[PDB]
Design an enzyme around this catalytic site. Structure first.
Site, PDB file in Angstrom:
ATOM      1  N   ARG A 153      53.435  44.107  48.224  1.00 18.98           N
ATOM      2  CA  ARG A 153      53.037  43.241  47.118  1.00 18.98           C
ATOM      3  C   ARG A 153      52.437  44.032  45.955  1.00 18.98           C
ATOM      4  O   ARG A 153      51.726  45.014  46.156  1.00 18.98           O
ATOM      5  CB  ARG A 153      52.037  42.191  47.604  1.00 18.98           C
ATOM      6  CG  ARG A 153      52.645  41.127  48.503  1.00 18.98           C
ATOM      7  CD  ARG A 153      51.574  40.272  49.164  1.00 18.98           C
ATOM      8  NE  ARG A 153      50.863  41.012  50.201  1.00 18.98           N
ATOM      9  CZ  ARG A 153      49.775  40.569  50.824  1.00 18.98           C
ATOM     10  NH1 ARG A 153      49.261  39.389  50.506  1.00 18.98           N
ATOM     11  NH2 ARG A 153      49.193  41.313  51.756  1.00 18.98           N
ATOM     12  N   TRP A 193      39.948  37.844  42.963  1.00 24.31           N
ATOM     13  CA  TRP A 193      39.125  37.645  44.156  1.00 24.31           C
ATOM     14  C   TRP A 193      37.781  38.376  44.028  1.00 24.31           C
ATOM     15  O   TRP A 193      36.724  37.802  44.304  1.00 24.31           O
ATOM     16  CB  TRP A 193      39.898  38.078  45.412  1.00 24.31           C
ATOM     17  CG  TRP A 193      40.975  37.071  45.750  1.00 24.31           C
ATOM     18  CD1 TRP A 193      40.909  35.712  45.579  1.00 24.31           C
ATOM     19  CD2 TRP A 193      42.289  37.342  46.265  1.00 24.31           C
ATOM     20  NE1 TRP A 193      42.085  35.121  45.987  1.00 24.31           N
ATOM     21  CE2 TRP A 193      42.952  36.101  46.400  1.00 24.31           C
ATOM     22  CE3 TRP A 193      42.967  38.509  46.625  1.00 24.31           C
ATOM     23  CZ2 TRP A 193      44.260  35.997  46.881  1.00 24.31           C
ATOM     24  CZ3 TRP A 193      44.269  38.403  47.108  1.00 24.31           C
ATOM     25  CH2 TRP A 193      44.898  37.156  47.233  1.00 24.31           C
ATOM     26  N   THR A 209      41.474  40.013  61.202  1.00 24.85           N
ATOM     27  CA  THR A 209      42.656  40.188  60.364  1.00 24.85           C
ATOM     28  C   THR A 209      42.619  39.332  59.097  1.00 24.85           C
ATOM     29  O   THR A 209      43.514  39.445  58.268  1.00 24.85           O
ATOM     30  CB  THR A 209      43.973  39.864  61.107  1.00 24.85           C
ATOM     31  OG1 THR A 209      43.981  38.482  61.481  1.00 24.85           O
ATOM     32  CG2 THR A 209      44.140  40.759  62.333  1.00 24.85           C
ATOM     33  N   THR A 210      41.593  38.495  58.929  1.00 25.54           N
ATOM     34  CA  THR A 210      41.384  37.844  57.632  1.00 25.54           C
ATOM     35  C   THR A 210      40.989  38.894  56.599  1.00 25.54           C
ATOM     36  O   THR A 210      41.127  38.663  55.384  1.00 25.54           O
ATOM     37  CB  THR A 210      40.260  36.780  57.662  1.00 25.54           C
ATOM     38  OG1 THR A 210      39.026  37.421  58.005  1.00 25.54           O
ATOM     39  CG2 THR A 210      40.568  35.646  58.660  1.00 25.54           C
ATOM     40  N   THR A 211      40.477  40.019  57.116  1.00 24.85           N
ATOM     41  CA  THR A 211      39.836  41.122  56.369  1.00 24.85           C
ATOM     42  C   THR A 211      38.420  40.777  55.887  1.00 24.85           C
ATOM     43  O   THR A 211      37.772  41.599  55.237  1.00 24.85           O
ATOM     44  CB  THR A 211      40.657  41.610  55.121  1.00 24.85           C
ATOM     45  OG1 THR A 211      40.549  40.674  54.035  1.00 24.85           O
ATOM     46  CG2 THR A 211      42.118  41.847  55.468  1.00 24.85           C
ATOM     47  N   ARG A 245      40.068  32.027  58.206  1.00 28.48           N
ATOM     48  CA  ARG A 245      41.066  32.033  59.281  1.00 28.48           C
ATOM     49  C   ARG A 245      41.739  30.670  59.444  1.00 28.48           C
ATOM     50  O   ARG A 245      42.968  30.566  59.432  1.00 28.48           O
ATOM     51  CB  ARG A 245      40.427  32.463  60.606  1.00 28.48           C
ATOM     52  CG  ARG A 245      41.394  32.482  61.810  1.00 28.48           C
ATOM     53  CD  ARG A 245      42.348  33.681  61.766  1.00 28.48           C
ATOM     54  NE  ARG A 245      43.480  33.421  60.901  1.00 28.48           N
ATOM     55  CZ  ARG A 245      44.124  34.338  60.184  1.00 28.48           C
ATOM     56  NH1 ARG A 245      43.763  35.616  60.230  1.00 28.48           N
ATOM     57  NH2 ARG A 245      45.145  33.968  59.425  1.00 28.48           N
ATOM     58  N   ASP A 292      43.729  29.371  56.093  1.00 29.69           N
ATOM     59  CA  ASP A 292      44.996  30.092  56.001  1.00 29.69           C
ATOM     60  C   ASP A 292      45.975  29.633  57.086  1.00 29.69           C
ATOM     61  O   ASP A 292      47.139  29.370  56.790  1.00 29.69           O
ATOM     62  CB  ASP A 292      44.778  31.604  56.092  1.00 29.69           C
ATOM     63  CG  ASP A 292      46.097  32.379  56.122  1.00 29.69           C
ATOM     64  OD1 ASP A 292      46.653  32.541  57.224  1.00 29.69           O
ATOM     65  OD2 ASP A 292      46.579  32.809  55.047  1.00 29.69           O
ATOM     66  N   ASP A 315      49.570  27.254  49.848  1.00 33.64           N
ATOM     67  CA  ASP A 315      49.446  28.684  50.092  1.00 33.64           C
ATOM     68  C   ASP A 315      49.357  29.429  48.761  1.00 33.64           C
ATOM     69  O   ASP A 315      50.368  29.879  48.221  1.00 33.64           O
ATOM     70  CB  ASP A 315      50.628  29.205  50.914  1.00 33.64           C
ATOM     71  CG  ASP A 315      50.431  30.643  51.372  1.00 33.64           C
ATOM     72  OD1 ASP A 315      49.429  31.283  50.970  1.00 33.64           O
ATOM     73  OD2 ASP A 315      51.289  31.132  52.135  1.00 33.64           O
ATOM     74  N   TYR A 341      47.789  32.096  48.562  1.00 38.52           N
ATOM     75  CA  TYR A 341      47.695  33.479  48.988  1.00 38.52           C
ATOM     76  C   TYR A 341      49.012  34.226  48.752  1.00 38.52           C
ATOM     77  O   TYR A 341      49.045  35.274  48.104  1.00 38.52           O
ATOM     78  CB  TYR A 341      47.299  33.544  50.461  1.00 38.52           C
ATOM     79  CG  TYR A 341      47.331  34.934  51.024  1.00 38.52           C
ATOM     80  CD1 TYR A 341      46.630  35.962  50.410  1.00 38.52           C
ATOM     81  CD2 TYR A 341      48.056  35.223  52.172  1.00 38.52           C
ATOM     82  CE1 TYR A 341      46.661  37.241  50.914  1.00 38.52           C
ATOM     83  CE2 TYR A 341      48.085  36.502  52.693  1.00 38.52           C
ATOM     84  CZ  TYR A 341      47.384  37.503  52.060  1.00 38.52           C
ATOM     85  OH  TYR A 341      47.406  38.779  52.562  1.00 38.52           O
TER      86      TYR A 341
HETATM   87  O1  LIG Z   1      47.444  36.381  56.513  1.00 36.46           O
HETATM   88  S1  LIG Z   1      46.270  37.145  56.986  1.00 36.46           S
HETATM   89  O2  LIG Z   1      45.558  36.355  58.012  1.00 36.46           O
HETATM   90  O3  LIG Z   1      46.726  38.417  57.587  1.00 36.46           O
HETATM   91  C1  LIG Z   1      45.242  37.472  55.714  1.00 36.46           C
HETATM   92  C2  LIG Z   1      44.731  36.180  55.079  1.00 36.46           C
HETATM   93  O4  LIG Z   1      44.324  35.271  56.106  1.00 36.46           O
HETATM   94  C3  LIG Z   1      43.546  36.461  54.154  1.00 36.46           C
HETATM   95  N1  LIG Z   1      44.006  37.164  52.945  1.00 36.46           N
HETATM   96  C4  LIG Z   1      43.220  36.797  51.741  1.00 36.46           C
HETATM   97  C5  LIG Z   1      41.995  37.694  51.568  1.00 36.46           C
HETATM   98  C6  LIG Z   1      41.338  37.457  50.209  1.00 36.46           C
HETATM   99  C7  LIG Z   1      41.715  36.107  49.606  1.00 36.46           C
HETATM  100  C8  LIG Z   1      41.772  35.017  50.669  1.00 36.46           C
HETATM  101  C9  LIG Z   1      42.773  35.336  51.780  1.00 36.46           C
HETATM  102 MG   LIG Z   2      48.682  32.762  57.616  1.00 36.73          MG
END
Ligand SMILES: O=S(=O)(O)C[C@@H](O)CNC1CCCCC1
Ligand SMILES: [Mg+2]
Ligand SMILES: [Mg+2]
Length: 536
Positions: free
Chosen positions: A252, A261, A389-391, A429, A432, A513, A515
């Site tokens: 990306r 963000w 994994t949300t980071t 989490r 998403d 979405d 994201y």
């Molecule tokens: O798809 S994943 O779970 O790998 C990653 C996703 O959940 C989170 N990515 C962004 C982080 C910063 C903006 C809000 C969401």
């Molecule tokens: Mg997802």
């Protein structure tokens, strides 16, 4: 080796942010006038003999106008006095506003302030249904509940139904403010986004607007906007110079979105260094995520994961050429961080973010293994991996790096996954997972959250999504409780975590979405925050 076909939309923005040269004359003029306005506003705050309602309205207005960061002490003093004087003789509008302002600032005012507005069953008196300003402030207050506030369980439903009913016949800009609130409550919005809306669409159009406050807000917003554009230009050049757009074309190209963000985490000028550090981290981990999700082989991801754990430039040997690219870039970035924090004697804190990045990558690999084996774990196991994994543990940790007052003790607290952080991570989490279920299901990801939920509890997709929504609500109550005094660390270090959660609500609004698809949700916010100034 057959790679997947790239499917990410190109950057929306082209080169338009790459170069921004500030007009010093205009900026200096703005700063000079703001100093005068700031002092005028300070005197409004410190005026003696103001009624409770007027004082609360003033504070609320200064906050929504986005200039409250100039008056943190004055506002804190005033709210502390109100909390301790503990007044009771109010109408709904004032009571709800009082409750919200105090709770948002960590003062644990009792929810019993609402009892006079309820019948014997804790249901709000429907005779209040024709009080629109009361309902609006009750609506906004309903979003700052903790687990101790079940008295307010009816507040959201009650205020929503009657605001909806009243809205079409309301005068402007009240109509627009109500309509907006129903789409996006204030407490869960991104501050600069809600400020931009309030200044331009509401306060500019109020018959009773205070002209001093309006001018202050417009000039301050536009002046901070000049700083933001400078930052984004600096980050855009840093990104361009790395040239992943061509050397890592599967990935990306979203540095502007990453900047938005970071801007949501904090917008104030004193967090300029912190913002730029944060956006670089969000950009870089995004590359890693793309490498795991849609390019690397199982074998490649393993080596990459192991290389990350060892964190040593001598490890570049074991990686394929393309993986060498990002691995060196990552190692360099953190060297840059250390270098940048050198003259402050804060270099040693960088290790905390590094450890969190290692954690993210370990769990990216676990996620990959699950996908490959077709494994659908129970929810508890799913979360044990998928929360990181949300980071978000990583991003909150990163957010502290450029904050000059952040101490080792603050990083120690954060490293223990305190409740407020865990809540923010959970919100990211489950929101998403709800928004991205169908697409991820299409791509065969049988270990997506809703799938794990469905199989574990033996329930439908609808029922799983409702369960995940409940988890988000519980988490928001945990965030609100986590802001209450005494706080375990200074509030300065809680607000980024609060703002990470807000970023989730805004990026995935209406279960969109936002994201994966920048044009869907984020593009208008970026235009409003980073392209168009507020007209004066
Ligand atoms: O798809 S994943 O779970 O790998 C990653 C996703 O959940 C989170 N990515 C962004 C982080 C910063 C903006 C809000 C969401
Ligand atoms: Mg997802
Ligand atoms: Mg991914």
């Amino acid at each position: 080796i057959v790679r997947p076909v790239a499917d990410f939309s190109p950057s929306l923005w082209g080169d338009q942010f790459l170069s921004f040269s500030i007009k010093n004359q205009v900026a200096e003029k703005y700063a000079k006038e703001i100093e005068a306005l700031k002092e005028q506003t300070r005197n409004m705050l410190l005026a003696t003999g103001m009624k409770l309602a007027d004082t609360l309205n003033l504070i609320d207005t200064i906050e929504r106008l986005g200039i409250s960061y100039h008056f943190e002490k004055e506002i804190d003093d005033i709210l502390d006095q109100i909390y301790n004087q503990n007044s009771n003789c109010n109408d709904l509008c004032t009571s709800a506003l009082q409750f919200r302002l105090l709770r948002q600032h960590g003062f644990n005012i009792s929810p019993e302030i609402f009892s006079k507005f309820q019948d014997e069953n804790g249901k709000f008196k429907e005779s209040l249904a024709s009080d629109v300003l009361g309902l609006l402030n009750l609506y906004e207050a309903s979003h700052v509940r903790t687990h101790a506030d079940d008295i307010l369980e009816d507040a959201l439903a009650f205020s929503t139904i009657h605001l909806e009913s009243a809205a079409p016949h309301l005068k402007s800009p009240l109509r627009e403010q109500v309509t907006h609130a129903l789409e996006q409550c204030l407490h869960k919005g991104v501050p600069r986004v809600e400020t931009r809306f309030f200044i331009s669409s509401i306060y500019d159009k109020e018959q009773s607007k205070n002209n001093v406050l309006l001018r202050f807000a417009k000039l301050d917003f536009n002046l901070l906007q000049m700083l933001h554009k400078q930052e984004l230009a600096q980050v855009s050049r840093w990104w361009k110079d790395l040239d992943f757009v061509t050397t890592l074309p599967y990935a990306r190209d979203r540095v502007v979105e990453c900047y938005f963000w970071a801007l949501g985490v904090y917008f104030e000028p004193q967090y300029s260094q912190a913002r730029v550090m944060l956006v670089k981290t969000i950009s870089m981990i995004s590359i890693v995520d793309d490498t795991f999700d849609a390019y690397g082989t199982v074998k490649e991801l393993e080596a990459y994961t192991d290389a990350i754990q060892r964190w040593d430039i001598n490890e570049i040997d074991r990686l394929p050429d393309y993986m060498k690219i990002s691995y060196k870039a990552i190692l360099d970035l953190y060297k840059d961080y250390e270098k940048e924090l050198s003259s402050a004697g804060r270099s040693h804190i960088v290790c905390h973010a590094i450890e969190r990045m290692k954690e993210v990558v370990r769990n990216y690999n676990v996620e990959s293994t699950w996908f490959i084996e077709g494994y659908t774990p129970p929810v508890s196991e799913y979360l044990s991996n998928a929360l990181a994994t949300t980071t978000y543990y990583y991003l909150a940790t990163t957010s502290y790096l450029g904050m000059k007052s952040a101490t080792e003790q603050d990083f120690e607290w954060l490293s223990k996954n305190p409740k407020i952080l865990e809540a923010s991570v959970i919100i990211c989490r489950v929101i998403d997972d709800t928004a991205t279920y169908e697409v991820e299901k299409s791509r065969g990801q049988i270990a997506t959250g809703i799938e794990c939920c469905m199989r574990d509890y033996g329930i439908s997709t609808k029922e799983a999504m409702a369960k995940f929504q409940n988890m988000a609500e519980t988490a928001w109550k945990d965030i609100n409780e986590g802001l209450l005094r005494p706080t375990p660390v200074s509030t300065e270090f809680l607000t980024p975590i609060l703002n990470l959660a807000r970023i989730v609500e805004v990026t995935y609004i209406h279960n969109l979405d936002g994201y994966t698809h920048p044009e869907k949700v984020l593009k208008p916010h970026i235009i409003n925050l980073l392209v168009d100034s507020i007209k004066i």
